[PDB]
Design a protein around this ligand. Sequence first.
Ligand code: CLA
Ligand code: CLA
Ligand code: CLA
Ligand code: CLA
Ligand SMILES: CC1=C(/C=C/C(C)=C/C=C/C(C)=C/C=C/C=C(C)/C=C/C=C(C)/C=C/C2=C(C)CCCC2(C)C)C(C)(C)CCC1
Ligand SMILES: CC1=C(/C=C/C(C)=C/C=C/C(C)=C/C=C/C=C(C)/C=C/C=C(C)/C=C/C2=C(C)CCCC2(C)C)C(C)(C)CCC1
Lengths: 80, 164, 146, 131, 132, 743
Amino acid sequence: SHTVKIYDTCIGCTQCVRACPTDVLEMVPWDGCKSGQIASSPRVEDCVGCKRCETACPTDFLSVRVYLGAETTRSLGLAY
Amino acid sequence: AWRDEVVVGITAPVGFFDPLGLSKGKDDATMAYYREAELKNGRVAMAACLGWYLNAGGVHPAFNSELSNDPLKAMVELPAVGWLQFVLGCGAIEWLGQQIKERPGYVPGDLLGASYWVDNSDEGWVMYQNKELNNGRLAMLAIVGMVYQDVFVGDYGDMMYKQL
Amino acid sequence: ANFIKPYNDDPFVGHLATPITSSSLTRALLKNLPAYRFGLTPLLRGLEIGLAHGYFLIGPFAQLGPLRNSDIGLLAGFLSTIGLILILTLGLTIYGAAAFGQEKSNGSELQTKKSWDQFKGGFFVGACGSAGFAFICLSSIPTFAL
Amino acid sequence: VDLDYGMKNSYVPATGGDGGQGQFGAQSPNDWRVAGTSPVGETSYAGAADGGEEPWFAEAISTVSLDLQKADETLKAFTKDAAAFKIEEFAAEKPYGFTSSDAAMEELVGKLGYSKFLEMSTKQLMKTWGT
Amino acid sequence: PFPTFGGSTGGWLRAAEVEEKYAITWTSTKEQIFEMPTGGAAIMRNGENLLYLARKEQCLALSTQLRTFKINDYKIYRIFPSGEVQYLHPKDGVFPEKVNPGRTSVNSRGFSIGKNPNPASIKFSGITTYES
Amino acid sequence: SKNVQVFVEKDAVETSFAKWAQPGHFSRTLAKGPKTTTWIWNLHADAHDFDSQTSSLEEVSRKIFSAHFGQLAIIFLWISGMHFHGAYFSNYSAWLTDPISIKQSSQVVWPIVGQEILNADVGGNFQGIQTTSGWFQMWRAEGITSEVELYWTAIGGLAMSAIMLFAGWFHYHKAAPKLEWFQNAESMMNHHLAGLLGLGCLSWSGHQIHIALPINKLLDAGVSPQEIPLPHEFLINRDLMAQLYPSFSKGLAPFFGGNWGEYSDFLTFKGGLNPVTGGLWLSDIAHHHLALSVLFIIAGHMYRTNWGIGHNMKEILEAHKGPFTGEGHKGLYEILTTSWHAQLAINLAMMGSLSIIVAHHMYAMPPYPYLATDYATQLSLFTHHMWIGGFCVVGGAAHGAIFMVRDYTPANNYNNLLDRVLRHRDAIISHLNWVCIFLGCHAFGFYIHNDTMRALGRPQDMFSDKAIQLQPIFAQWIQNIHLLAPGTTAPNALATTSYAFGGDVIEVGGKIAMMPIKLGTADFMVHHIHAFTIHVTVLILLKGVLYARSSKLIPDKANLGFRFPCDGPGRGGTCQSSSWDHVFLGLFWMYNSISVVIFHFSWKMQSDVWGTITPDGAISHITGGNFAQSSITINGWLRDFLWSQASQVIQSYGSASSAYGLIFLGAHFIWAFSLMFLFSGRGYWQELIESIVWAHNKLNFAPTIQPRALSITQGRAVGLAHYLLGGIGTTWAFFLARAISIT
Ligand code: CLA
Ligand code: CLA
Ligand code: CLA
Ligand code: CLA
Ligand SMILES: CC1=C(/C=C/C(C)=C/C=C/C(C)=C/C=C/C=C(C)/C=C/C=C(C)/C=C/C2=C(C)CCCC2(C)C)C(C)(C)CCC1
Ligand SMILES: CC1=C(/C=C/C(C)=C/C=C/C(C)=C/C=C/C=C(C)/C=C/C=C(C)/C=C/C2=C(C)CCCC2(C)C)C(C)(C)CCC1
């Protein structure tokens, strides 16, 4: 459904993965930052488009960007 | 045996009341018919009582209050079309009731199917049921008394508590 | 005593067993309605439903329509009812096409194309005929006086 | 367990503006567009639940559930690869008197259950398997 | 192993029976009252507990509450109509907020957000700048 | 020891001006300092939210008690000013002598910039603004007579204001009560229901019986105000009272004995309105308060305190449970004794509801001398109290929601009434939605149908009293019941409680005070519209309370708070999903509802009640009875009401009513101004600000407190505020200007 992309400016603060309401983001090993960790979006099929993740990023400009797109039952948050 | 299981209807003033023993040899089915009849006759009586009281009081705000305050006179004044609807409507409900009766687990008198949620184990349930029966029994006698007063004595209002 | 319980004893389904939802009265009435009754064929189900809905629809038009005070008011009311029935029938036809498709197999399941078509047909006949019956009845109203 | 059951759906990702099937598939294999209620003694939604004497509330009769025993299997199957990676690393770090990966797994999971096994560092594992 | 609840009109609907359904499980050490996302209060059982919901978010919301009770053994599954089950969370046994060796990066662009291509350049291509 | 005791902490807070110089001290976040303009706005928006400023109920409670003293001080100063202005800047004396001709005025403008035109020739050799609050009538009823007395009550007010302010300081800085003291509901109710209300009524009855009644009788008879004996004289010389009311001769002997009948001279159940003044008989009012006093005092002895006898509210609440309601009212006591928001909800709703009742009962049964004939005052009071009520009711709902989000605890509420309500919320909201649609389609449809029919030249097909008619049969019936009550169901009464139900036309000064108000098809149509408006308001507000903590869309709304902008652009859009936003939308519907009600009052009265009657029986209503056949269509309201009755404001220039014209225009402007906040978004504004800041920077200067755009929530608030001010303001001027002329 929606598209979430992570950029090299990430600092591995883990704040984004701790804010997702649907477990779409994970922290994976990396060497480009001091923390030695980067964020990934393995399960974008469950993204609802809340953008809470973006609100949590501390980088000058979001290192995590959510681009809204095709809509499915899951993305539209339909319990019915 | 109905006598060995029945719990509702047996109260304090007199306990089990069958002076003429009209239920000694009756089977469960006959006894069930009796209880259903008792409840129905009583419930209808309670309603009739309220109706009579309202009309007698003068609160009959229908047909521009044209009909008489005397309940028995009013019935004569009512068009037949009104009566036909009444009988037919009640008849319809009677049919539905028969359907409910056939369904397994029917407790004589229960049309709401309260058996689904509550049983006679609950004392509150049995007590409230007793209140319906007791008030119904009283109402039956009352409606019969009132008619006598209106048809013979000549009055259709309270002749007991009216004297403040 | 609790008169409200989880439906079907499932504490997590979105429904509750209230006296209104599950009482002998409600169960009995719904079981014997033409829509859910057992044994009725698709055509007969539609017929009963149509007969019922057509009879009560002539009233509103006949007594409150544009030509209510005209001598031909009842006739006009009948025509209006027939028009409404046609609109409703179009809806039924269209619904069936979209919901069921084009070729069916199960059969005798109100929820199939063939069964739905039969159901629709019954509704039309029953509704129009019922409206006609009301026309005949309303032509001369009995006073039931002796 | 068909780990691809969800992925095997009718969804076809679009060119641009779609994340894709992701990790567990984007949509259910089954179509939600089923029919409505049916008369007594009839069924509508394919493998639907018979409404008995209350067909009107048939949709409230559950037929989809989770078996606790079966639940264990799905946990193991979907986490098989992770377990493999974990044990592999443990093996790489010169295990004391090592035997076979599988054997080690059984021994290491006999203790520390399975969930605990998945959440333990190779170092902790080696300490645990010192014996 | 269902927790003690009296029912609500906010439970699941047909989609749970024809499209897809979810389930969360956890273990408790005491019987305590929690608030369910559907609406209302329920009492968990002393031991295993299972509850069904219609959305993953509803399940994960409850997990947050569970963490307050110091319960961290929760597991979430998706049950399809045919009976197939998918284990979803914690996917690898380790919570996502904790780096677990063995997880690969996905959807990562190796440049600052400002280095994406210009829209005009990719015209009549079908791709987007952020996917280019 | 004793269950009810007084616990107070001495010297709790030091009095100093240090915190005054540290704006934002109350908040941890704001205290750090200003970095953007948002800090400024937040300072003002979080000033009185004590719950967020402290985590201890005792502290929050202490602040509330003291803050209340502050409001009381302000109220006292307000009342004081009014009496003073009525002593030094009014024509009360002249009006007192000729109430029918002289017009009430208590405000005078300085002769600056032609504003003097606003000083009208009210009468009595006096020029000023015609006030419409009804002070003169009240003072006459009390028996003021002089302006010296008004001065003294003003001084008393100032003194009282000071005492309250001291009390606030004292009970917060020097003697602050502890939480245990506050949590004594039974005692509080006993005291407030027997002391505040009971003793209050009794005291008032004393004034009315010994001072007001006698003086007013003399005034009505014709005695010149100067010739009426001073109040103290009546209190001392019993003989004087005996002359007026021939029972004081017997003294209090009849009272101690059981012969209360002898006091029938001043305690009566006459009913109806005094023919001379057009107001309720004071004798009846005196008996009213006396009777109420006894009732309240008795009621104040129902709850247990320290002597065993009495009721414990907890027990009463817990006992009331039934088969369909689980644990029943268990848990409510704790909620209402541990949550200020919950208490405010109930109290605020009831207070607002009372105001609406006051509005209805105070016009049908005019309570003051020479009030009914003053159409301006009547209209002003009805509308004023109708509004105050609406706001308060919506406020109750708001605080109810704040409770659910901040104080509700699942543990303390298991299977209680509250829990069960939140468990079938879908059913409740679904049904109410339908009810609203049903009512709205049918009620408003009637009007649209009629408009179409009249325009198509088919008047015989309209829902009118001359065609298809929809008569309010039930209401017509109740009216008859109330009309025939005197002498039957109310044997000892002498007249109808209100002439609205039926009776004769009471006229004072050639003007109609009250007349039977009849109900027809038009009334049916409007009443049902009122139902629709109120129902929709409840839907929005109730939905907010029930879905405050969670929803299918946002399962964790609680954590987000009571006032969050949204959750995001996802789920298809989650804008305005907070409970605060529900209150935001509810206020708009409350505005609509009240507006229609006040308009109904204005047109109905000016058409079927108010007017003049000749010496013989000829009644000429102000508008001429147009309500029946014109209020049945929307065009009628636009033409026969708004367009026609607005001729006064639009043509007010060059007159003392010019102010209303200017305000009418100004209000329209503010209403429109608000629409820019309600339709736009923060994004556009923030970007515009960026460009503007560029300019300032280009000139080497820019604020360190970086300029930022108003928050999403604030934007909505600013819009609603201006919208309400503009709309209400417009009607305010429209009504007042029209009323001045009709009077
Ligand atoms: C004149 C402007 C206007 C109108 C007509 C409406 C209409 C409505 N609003 Mg609304 N609203 C408005 C302005 C308006 N709003 C503004 C400015 C705001 C901002 C505060 C809101 C905020 C708002 C909220 C927050 C809520 C509403 C709700 C409602 C609905 C009430 C239910 C009802 O009566 O249905 C009847 C609707 C009618 C328009 C009646 C007239 C229609 C005809 C006369 C009846 C017959 C027509 C028939 C159905 C079809 C004819 C066929 C042919 C014409 C094609 C209704 C759709 C409530 C809602 O949805 O709950 C139900 C609700 O919660 N409104
Ligand atoms: C419709 C009438 C009716 C019917 C069918 C019943 C039936 C029953 N009653 Mg009952 N009852 C009635 C009216 C009725 N009652 C009235 C009006 C009173 C108030 C006095 C009572 C007071 C009463 C008590 C206190 C008790 C019962 C009990 C019972 C049950 C066991 C006793 C029995 O078998 O009676 C058999 C009765 C019948 C088969 C029908 C009654 C016989 C008819 C009415 C003959 C008419 C006689 C009467 C004098 C007619 C004149 C009336 C008026 C003109 C004076 C049985 C189901 C007992 C119970 O519930 O135990 C489980 C019990 O303890 N009844
Ligand atoms: C509800 C309270 C209230 C209100 C609204 C009014 C309103 C009015 N009064 Mg009035 N009055 C009141 C109470 C009130 N009064 C009371 C209680 C008394 C008894 C003391 C009086 C005594 C009184 C007299 C004697 C007179 C008025 C006059 C007036 C009119 C001119 C007001 C004025 O001075 O403008 C001009 C305003 C000023 C000169 C004040 C200067 C503005 C100050 C400096 C701004 C405030 C500074 C700010 C708070 C700094 C903050 C510091 C921090 C510590 C808080 C005006 C209509 C006058 C009038 O009608 O004349 C025809 C007049 O002569 N009043
Ligand atoms: C008994 C009355 C009463 C009391 C004690 C409270 C108390 C409270 N309310 Mg509440 N409320 C009330 C009535 C009341 N309310 C009513 C009637 C409504 C419906 C409109 C509301 C709606 C409401 C909302 C929607 C919210 C509160 C909030 C709050 C809390 C913080 C208030 C705050 O931010 O202070 C600061 C106060 C202000 C900034 C108000 C200043 C006045 C503004 C600027 C409007 C002035 C209009 C003015 C009269 C127009 C003059 C025109 C002229 C210029 C020409 C506090 C517990 C807030 C909260 O967070 O609760 C926890 C919150 O979100 N209340
Ligand atoms: C309120 C209520 C109720 C209900 C009621 C109702 C709702 C009714 C309805 C009714 C109806 C609604 C009915 C209907 C009827 C119909 C009919 C009766 C029809 C008929 C028809 C016919 C008979 C035929 C026709 C035809 C055809 C078929 C075709 C051809 C031609 C012809 C004509 C032959 C009751 C009482 C139960 C109870 C209480 C509640
Ligand atoms: C207007 C106003 C005001 C007011 C004033 C006043 C209100 C005055 C008065 C005062 C007073 C003038 C008071 C009085 C009181 C009295 C009382 C409250 C009485 C009581 C009684 C009693 C207590 C009794 C007892 C007893 C009994 C019961 C019987 C036996 C014997 C004995 C003794 C035991 C002010 C200025 C504030 C402010 C402004 C406004």
